[PDB]
Amino acid sequence: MGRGSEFGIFAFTDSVFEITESVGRFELKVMRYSGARGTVIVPYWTENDTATESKDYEGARGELVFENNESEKFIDLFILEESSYEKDVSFKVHIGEPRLAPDDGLAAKIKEVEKKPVQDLTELDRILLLSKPRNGELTTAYVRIRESQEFKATVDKLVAKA
């Protein structure tokens, strides 16, 4: 906890998304909820499920930098066209622990406090921990990729033809 933060709370808009291998570049929003104060780094990385990195989509890995009044940042994907008649395939994109930018006032003590023993936490440093930039519960997005939806109109009209 708590339910809020000032730095603040980072998550995807939801867990579940669907394209279209024809979409090219897919912008996936990472939302900053409750208080846009400070500059916060958010790590992200891609991972295979049924969709595979060399074929279905290109691998994306890095960090997002949210400035002082930035409440939104986007991950570009990108998604590979392979003119399939039929496909239902999917991959994951995760976000790691958001961290405050090294230079600003609180960066330390936070990194120092958040790796001392819990039974040693002091009243004020658990206030620090409470105020920390945090993840929401939506820290994994699943991206389902489908056939171009009327490539398949078009194969189907062709199939019915004699």
Side-chain angles (χ1 to χ4, degrees), residues 5-6 8 13 37-38 58 62 65 86 94 99 113 119 132:
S5 175
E6 206 179 346
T13 266
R37 196 50 69 246
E58 279 157 12
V65 184
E86 209 178 317
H94 309 288
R99 106 194 74 165
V113 162
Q119 53 274 293
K132 200 170 75 162

Side-chain angles (χ1 to χ4, degrees), residues 122-161:
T122 224
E123 186 169 41
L124 21 190
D125 60 36
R126 34 210 225 248
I127 295 161
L128 251 68
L129 256 17
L130 277 160
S131 80
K132 200 170 75 162
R134 257 163 52 243
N135 278 138
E137 42 216 35
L138 263 29
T139 58
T140 296
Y142 299 94
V143 180
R144 184 182 191 195
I145 323 170
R146 308 301 303 281
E147 338 99 17
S148 163
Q149 198 44 28
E150 295 200 345
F151 194 62
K152 174 214 145 100
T154 280
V155 182
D156 277 331
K157 226 314 283 276
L158 202 96
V159 165
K161 269 223 152 72

Side-chain angles (χ1 to χ4, degrees), residues 46-53 55-107:
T46 231
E47 174 185 16
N48 288 166
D49 194 13
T50 312
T52 168
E53 186 180 311
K55 181 177 84 158
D56 293 295
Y57 69 101
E58 279 157 12
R61 222 148 293 104
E63 289 176 340
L64 300 163
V65 184
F66 289 73
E67 298 295 349
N68 196 245
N69 275 344
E70 295 183 5
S71 65
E72 277 167 354
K73 271 277 148 82
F74 292 87
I75 305 159
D76 295 343
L77 282 173
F78 303 56
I79 294 141
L80 302 168
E81 171 79 77
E82 59 183 347
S83 274
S84 325
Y85 318 108
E86 209 178 317
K87 79 138 136 260
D88 175 8
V89 103
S90 91
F91 69 101
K92 307 166 175 169
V93 26
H94 309 288
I95 52 174
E97 262 100 323
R99 106 194 74 165
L100 220 43
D103 64 316
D104 70 66
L106 286 320

